[PDB]
């Protein structure tokens, strides 16, 4: 004794709050357990929504893959069929390449002759040379019966026969200075002196030389320089006679095949030479050839394209190749997650049942609530009547 009065009220005022709060806490613990049952219903809602989101992915992917498959097996059958058409196109292109070179080669061979001789003439007509005789093939006449055999045995009939080893060379220079053509020269001086006398021919098959009438016997040696024991067989009595008699020979089959002394065996396809001896030619035209060298360019390019478009077919199928396992992994990860989700869901739908039973229990029991409730008013009065 003796306590004041202002101090005397706070003595019990405090006592209220030490329960007024103990009430407030019992209300919080109540409002927490209701939250769980309310956050858990939130999660379980989001998971139900996620799980529906995956089942949308999977359907999208399973559609994409199962479609890409149908496109793969279709893109293959097209690559297979197209690559075939390419090889055909390639074969045919090669064919035309061959013919193009032939047609060009031969029109060039012609144009050489028609260019050297035109210019070699003009040369000797100005007098700038003497001793130019011209193409040996126009320096002897033969029986039309052998026109082919001679032409394909002795392509040297296109040589130029001259005297001076230097007048050959006087011509060569003229040809360079103006770019006129190239030529070969049979030099009469340095030319070996041959026995143009009759030989004994095996199987009585004649020698090409004899069938030849030179315009002047001043050329009769030359004609033996090109042809010499060059026999004229027919339909392959040659491989028996030529390849080995006592003496080896050089025979032309009448239609045009050739076995040379060397062992050479030359057989054609569908061309034989004609007209190298005096006895509408198969000539091309610098437009006919121009027309073939024109279309080859097309066929060459239509190849360059068709090859590119096939290449790109291959690259595209490579992409599809590099997807069928990528889609199929994503489709696997979703199903693999979706199963993991539906596992987290059933574990949550048992946590709601448990937090809900914790809540109900704490609402169906008001023991401590009634207790703290009385003492709060009992002091509100004790304070009020003290």
């Amino acid at each position: 004794e003796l306590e004041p009065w202002d101090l005397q009220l706070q003595e019990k005022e405090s006592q209220i709050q030490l329960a007024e709060s103990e009430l407030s806490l019992l209300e919080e613990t109540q409002a927490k357990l209701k939250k769980n049952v309310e956050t858990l219903e939130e999660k379980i809602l989001a998971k139900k929504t996620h799980k529906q989101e995956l089942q949308d992915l999977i359907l999208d992917l399973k559609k994409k893959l199962n479609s890409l498959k149908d496109e793969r097996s279709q893109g293959e059958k097209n690559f297979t069929s197209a690559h075939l058409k390419l090889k055909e196109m390639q074969k045919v292109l090669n064919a035309h390449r061959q013919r193009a070179m032939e047609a060009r080669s031969s029109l060039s061979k012609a144009q050489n002759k028609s260019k050297v001789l035109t210019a070699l003439s003009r040369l000797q007509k100005s007098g700038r040379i003497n001793g130019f005789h011209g193409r040996l093939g126009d320096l002897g006449v033969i029986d039309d019966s052998f026109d082919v055999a001679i032409s394909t045995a002795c392509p040297r009939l296109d040589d130029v026969v001259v005297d001076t080893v230097e007048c050959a060379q006087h011509c060569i220079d003229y040809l360079r200075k103006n770019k006129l053509g190239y030529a070969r020269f049979i030099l009469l001086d340095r030319l070996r002196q041959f026995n143009l006398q009759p030989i004994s021919t095996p199987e009585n098959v004649p020698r090409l030389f004899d069938l030849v009438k030179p315009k002047n016997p001043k050329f009769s040696n030359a004609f033996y320089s090109v042809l010499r024991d060059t026999l004229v067989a027919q339909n392959l009595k040659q491989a028996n006679n030529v390849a080995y008699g006592k003496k080896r020979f050089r025979v032309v089959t009448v239609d045009g095949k050739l076995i040379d002394i060397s062992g050479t065996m030359s057989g054609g396809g569908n061309h034989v030479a004609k007209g190298l001896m005096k006895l509408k030619v198969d000539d091309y035209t610098p437009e006919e050839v121009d027309k073939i060298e024109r279309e080859l360019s097309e066929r060459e390019n239509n190849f360059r394209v068709a090859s590119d478009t096939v290449h790109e077919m291959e690259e595209e199928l490579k992409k599809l190749r590099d997807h069928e396992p990528d889609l199929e992994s994503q489709i696997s990860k979703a199903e693999m997650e979706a199963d993991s989700l539906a596992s987290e869901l059933t574990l949550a739908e048992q946590q709601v049942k448990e937090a809900e039973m914790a809540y109900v229990k704490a609402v169906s029991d008001k023991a401590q609530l009634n207790v703290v409730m009385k003492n709060l008013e009992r002091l509100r009065g004790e304070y009020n009547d003290l």
Binding site: V116, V165, I186, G263, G267
Partner: protein
Amino acid sequence: KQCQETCDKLRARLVEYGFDPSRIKDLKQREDKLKSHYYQTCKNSEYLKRRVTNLEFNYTKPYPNFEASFVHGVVGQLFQIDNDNIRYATALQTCAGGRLFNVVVQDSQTATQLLERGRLRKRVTIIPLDKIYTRPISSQVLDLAKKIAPGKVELAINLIRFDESITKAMEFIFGNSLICEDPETAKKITFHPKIRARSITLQGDVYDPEGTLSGGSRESLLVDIQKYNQIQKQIETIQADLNHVTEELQTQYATSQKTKTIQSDLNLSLHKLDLAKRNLDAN
């Protein structure tokens, strides 16, 4: 626990079966770049293939028991020139002439077969390795040619390279020409009492000891041929480089078809490494 063990037991069962994902992957990395080198090389060569046409011999097999290893090829693709020696192309090309496109066969019979029962699209000359003969220019004559014109004469066969298996065909084509720096040299060698040999002017002219002299206005064929031959080998390489890989990869599928079971089971097994690791989140 049983999680990292069930997986490992199936995982190490894949290595014993010979399947590995990191390999099969690494192969397609190559193959994809080898198919696109093959295509690239070829594409870049087609220009050249147009000018080198006569290098190709087309024949249909005459008989089912006809040896195809009796046809050696076209001359043009049967000898090569060292780079040093390129400057002699034009020579060598002239020296050979048309014989560049001759076909070399094992024996005279094979020639006759090709000619008749072979369906030849266009005319071909055929050098039969067992019938050809040429008197080759001797030691002594080449030795004399070298003294008459030092460092300016060479036997054309000495400027090329070829496998001994076809020696006789090269001997036939080249073994009897002297290549010479200049007309002056040619003249001198060819027309000389003890050395009567064919001579080819470096610039493409020919002095033949038989009253023959070529000449007149004209890098050409024999060069593109050499270039084409190179490229065509480079390609054979790749096609074989690739083929090796492909079979190495195509075989690496049989082990990945044992994946049809063990990987078809490890996939749902590598699953539960998390299925259980999830639950081990404590409560």
